[PDB]
Amino acid sequence: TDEALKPCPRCQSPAKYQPHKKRGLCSRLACGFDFCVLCLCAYHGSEDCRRG
Ligand SMILES: [Zn+2]
Ligand SMILES: [Zn+2]
């Protein structure tokens, strides 16, 4: 099994990982970011990710 926590796309800090919501929230109070864990952009909820 093992643990999982993803780096924040702004500051690379270990963000609070939410695999049940495909969401990640930064632990750095000056950064305070909310991202999609599939494409590492600002969180887009129920929408699908984008190519690049
Ligand atoms: Zn951050
Ligand atoms: Zn995405």
From Swiss-Prot:
Required to establish and maintain the arrest of oocytes at the second meiotic metaphase until fertilization. Acts by inhibiting the anaphase-promoting complex/cyclosome (APC/C) ubiquitin ligase. Probably recognizes and binds to some phosphorylated proteins and promotes their ubiquitination and degradation. Plays a vital role in modulating the ubiquitilation of CCNB1 and CDK1 during gametogenesis. This is F-box only protein 43. The gene is Fbxo43. Ubiquitinated in response to calcium, which promotes proteasomal degradation. Part of a SCF (SKP1-cullin-F-box) protein ligase complex. Interaction with SKP1 does not occur. Interacts with ANAPC2; the interaction is direct, ANAPC4, CDC16, CDC23; the interaction is direct, ANAPC10; the interaction is direct and CDC26, during spermatogenesis. Interacts with CDC20. Disruption phenotype: Both male and female with knockout of the gene are viable but sterile, consistent with the fact that the gene mediates metaphase II arrest but does not interfere with mitosis. The absence of the gene results in the arrest of meiosis I progression in spermatocytes at early diplotene of prophase I and is associated with a decrease of CDK1 activity. Zn(2+) 1 binds at C8, C11, C26, C31. A zinc finger (ZBR-type) spans 4-52. Zn(2+) 2 binds at C36, C39, H44, C49. Present in testis and ovary (at protein level). Expression is high in immature oocytes, and diminishes after oocyte activation. Expressed post-meiotically in spermatids and sperm. It comes from Mus musculus (Mouse).
